[PDB]
């Protein structure tokens, strides 16, 4: 098996920690959802190729501009996350997260991931966003942002239901192999 490194980036409310927890346990924890994620090395076989994919989170480093880049050396694939219940998390992608990752991880594929897709049809979410003249991120808004920033691709998932989670990490593995 070949070793590859994945790092997830995005704003504090984007759901990156929950996404790594659910994938690494293959389950949304029923008793206690951890606050933090240390690291994990997943055994993934994609399109007949076996990879050891090391997973890292940048949660807690969003306010520390000199500590945060220490997570980037030798990254093979970036997951750049936003939450579908937070159009504000999508606005910070093009001119904050994107130029940073392009500087520290040149030529590394970026997959833009819309997290919490289950909230797109949640009435409480729609009511809360409507007070700030907002609505959940639309699929075309996510695709257009991924297109604009030069992302390798655009994907959506829900850590809560597990829908789309396995597909995100299998595609990240394929991107890291290219």
């Amino acid at each position: 098996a070949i070793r590859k490194k994945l790092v997830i980036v995005g704003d504090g409310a984007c759901g990156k920690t929950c996404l790594l927890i659910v994938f690494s346990k293959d389950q949304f924890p029923e008793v206690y959802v951890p606050t933090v994620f240390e690291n994990y090395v997943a055994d993934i076989e994609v399109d007949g190729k076996q990879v050891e994919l090391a997973l890292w989170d940048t949660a807690g480093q969003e306010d520390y501009d000199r500590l945060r880049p220490l997570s980037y050396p030798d990254t093979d694939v970036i997951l750049m996350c936003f939450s579908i219940d937070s159009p504000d998390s999508l606005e910070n992608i093009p001119e904050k997260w994107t130029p940073e990752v392009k500087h520290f991880c040149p030529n590394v594929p970026i997959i833009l991931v819309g997290n919490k897709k289950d909230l797109r049809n949640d009435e409480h979410t729609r009511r809360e966003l409507a007070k700030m003249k907002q609505e959940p991120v639309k699929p075309e808004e996510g695709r257009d942002m991924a297109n604009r920033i030069g992302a390798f691709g655009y994907m959506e998932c829900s850590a809560k239901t597990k829908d789309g989670v396995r597909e995100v990490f299998e595609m990240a593995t394929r991107a890291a192999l290219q």
Binding site: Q61, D63, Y64, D74
Partner: protein, 245 residues
């Protein structure tokens, strides 16, 4: 880690670690607070274990088996003895607080009601100055350590055999040299996330809410100072490149 502490922190949560008849005696809010305190101690136990892999398995193994040039092992594992002393002492205080809280006749049933004062002590005074100095040095030497590791692995056969040998066991899967270095750099930024969630469930006693609020502020002050004191060292960097920063 030692077996006694590993077993005490084997469960996925405090609610699964204690006896069910003890859990049933507590309110939901206390259970939520105890689950996050348990995660802080459990991850601190693992962080000390990562430092012991660096000092005992890698560093000492390289000094005892390999013929590396002097100053090479210190370059791979900067500040590891100082980091081990800081975190082993902090872990000792956390585990003693849990041990004193155990019910008589039990080695698993406890409630920690007063964590805030312990966190204020850790993140203030001489111990905070030592954490700040040690992480500013470690994090500024992080990139150099990774490059030195990569260079030795690519060019030295005996170094490559040593690494492959000691990292082969399944229990070292997440703990190669580069993975340990990043686990240590990321440890300090996990503390505000854990303390904020403990504080969210510690409003029942106003003195405790105030102490955890003070601790959260001290940890953020420490992180800001460490972040401001980092400048990556690079082997062979010239003075002109440094003063033109």
């Amino acid at each position: 880690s030692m077996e006694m502490d590993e077993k005490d922190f084997a469960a996925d949560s405090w609610s699964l670690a204690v006896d069910s008849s003890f859990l049933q005696q507590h309110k939901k809010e206390v259970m939520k607070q105890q689950d996050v305190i348990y995660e802080l101690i459990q991850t601190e136990l693992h962080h000390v274990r990562t430092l012991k892999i660096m000092t005992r398995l890698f560093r000492t193994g390289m000094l005892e088996e390999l013929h590396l040039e002097p100053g090479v092992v210190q370059g791979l594992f900067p500040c590891v003895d100082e980091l081990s002393d800081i975190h082993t002492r902090f872990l000792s205080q956390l585990l003693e607080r849990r041990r004193q809280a155990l019910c008589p006749g039990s080695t698993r049933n406890f409630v920690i009601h007063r964590l805030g004062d312990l966190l204020i002590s850790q993140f203030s005074g001489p111990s905070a100055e030592q954490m700040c100095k040690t992480y500013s040095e470690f994090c500024s030497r992080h990139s150099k350590a990774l490059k030195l590791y990569k260079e030795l692995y690519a060019r030295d056969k005996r170094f490559q055999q040593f690494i492959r040998k000691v990292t082969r066991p399944a229990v070292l899967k997440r703990h190669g040299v580069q993975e340990c270095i990043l686990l240590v750099t990321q440890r300090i930024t996990k503390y505000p996330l854990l303390i904020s969630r403990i504080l969210q469930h510690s409003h029942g006693i106003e003195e405790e809410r105030q102490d955890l609020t003070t601790a959260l502020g001290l940890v953020k002050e420490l992180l800001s100072n460490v972040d401001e004191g980092i400048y990556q060292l690079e082997k062979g960097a010239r003075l002109q490149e440094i003063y033109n920063r």
